[PDB]
Amino acid sequence: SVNIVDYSDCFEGISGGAIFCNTKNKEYNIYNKELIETRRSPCSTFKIVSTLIGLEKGVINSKESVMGYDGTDYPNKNWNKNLSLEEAFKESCVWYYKKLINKVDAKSVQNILDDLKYGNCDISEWEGDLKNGKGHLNGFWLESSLQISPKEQVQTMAKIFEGDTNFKKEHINILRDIMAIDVNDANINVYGKTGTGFDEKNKRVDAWFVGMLEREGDTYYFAIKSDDSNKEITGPKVKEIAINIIKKYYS
Numbered sequence: 001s002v003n004i005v006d007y008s009d010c011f012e013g014i015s016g017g018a019i020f021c022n023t024k025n026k027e028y029n030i031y032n033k034e035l036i037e038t039r040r041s042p043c044s045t046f047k048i049v050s051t052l053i054g055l056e057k058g059v060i061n062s063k064e065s066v067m068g069y070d071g072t073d074y075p076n077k078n079w080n081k082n083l084s085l086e087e088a089f090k091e092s093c094v095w096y097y098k099k100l101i102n103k104v105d106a107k108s109v110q111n112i113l114d115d116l117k118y119g120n121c122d123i124s125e126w127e128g129d130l131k132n133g134k135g136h137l138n139g140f141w142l143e144s145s146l147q148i149s150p151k152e153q154v155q156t157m158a159k160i161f162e163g164d165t166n167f168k169k170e171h172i173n174i175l176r177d178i179m180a181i182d183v184n185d186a187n188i189n190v191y192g193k194t195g196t197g198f199d200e201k202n203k204r205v206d207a208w209f210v211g212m213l214e215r216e217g218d219t220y221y222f223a224i225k226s227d228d229s230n231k232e233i234t235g236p237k238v239k240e241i242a243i244n245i246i247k248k249y250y251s
C-alpha cells in the first residue's frame with residue numbers, strides 16, 4: 001500500500017522529500033507527501049527523456065553517437081570535445097542536449113510528453129529562461145516552463161523501464177547503460193540522473209536525483225528532491241542522500 005515514512009535522518013537537516021515505488025506489489029513509500037506532489041522544473045533530469053526523444057527521432061543512434069562539436073570554448077574541460085552520448089549524459093553537457101533537442105520539431109516533443117504524462121507538458125518557453133543571461137545555454141526544461149512532480153517523475157520512469165511506452169527496447173537499454181551508477185555495493189543495481197536549479201521566484205533550490213533500483217528480483221522507481229533555501233544544496237548532494245537512503249532501507 002501507500003506508506004508514509006520518515007527518512008529525515010538521511011537528509012541530515014536538509015529540506016526535501018523522497019518517494020520509492022515498487023510496481024509489482026504496488027508498494028509506495030513516501031516521505032514528505034506535500035513536496036512529493038509539487039511540480040517543479042526537472043532541470044538536467046530531463047536528459048533521461050531527451051535522450052529517448054533523440055534516439056526515437058534518429059538524431060542519435062547509440063551510446064557512441066556524436067553531435068558535431070564546433071569548437072566553442074566552455075569552462076568545463078570535458079565539454080570542449082566531440083563527446084559521445086554516454087559522456088554528454090554523465091557530464092550533463094548542455095550544448096550537446098540543446099543541439100539535439102533543437103533538431104526535433106516542437107509538435108513531436110509535445111506529443112511525446114503528452115504520451116508520457118510528463119508533468120504539465122508545457123514547452124511554450126522553448127528557448128528557456130533567457131532573463132538569466134545564459135543565452136543558448138537554456139531551454140524549456142531548465143527552470144523554465146516545463147514542470148513535473150517527484151511522484152510524476154517516478155510514474156514516468158516506471159512506464160519507460162517496465163516497457164509500457166512505445167520507445168524501442170534497444171533505446172531503453174542504451175538509457176539503462178548510461179544511467180548506471182557505481183554505489184560500491186554489488187548486491188543492488190542503481191541507475192539515475194542528477195539535476196540542479198534555483199527557483200528564483202521562491203528563492204529555493206530544485207535539487208534532484210531520479211532513477212531506479214534493482215535488488216533480488218524487485219525494482220523500485222525513485223525520486224529524491226530538495227527544496228532547501230541553501231544554495232549549496234545541489235543535485236550531487238541529493239544523490240548522496242538518495243544513496244544513504246537506499247543503503248539503509250532498501251538493502
Ligand SMILES: *C(=O)N1C[C@H](NOS(=O)(=O)O)CC[C@H]1C(N)=O
Nearest residue numbers: 043044092094142143195196197
Ligand atoms: C542540470 O541540472 N544542469 C545544472 C544547471 N541547471 O541550471 S538551470 O536550471 O538554471 O539551467 C545547468 C544545466 C545543467 C548542467 N549541469 O550544465
Ligand SMILES: NC(=O)[C@@H]1CC[C@@H]2CN1C(=O)N2OS(=O)(=O)O
Nearest residue numbers: 181182183184185239240243244
Ligand atoms: N557517487 C557515488 O556513486 C557514491 C560516492 C562514492 C562511492 C560510490 N558511491 C558510494 O556509495 N560510495 O561510497 S561508499 O559506499 O562509502 O564507498
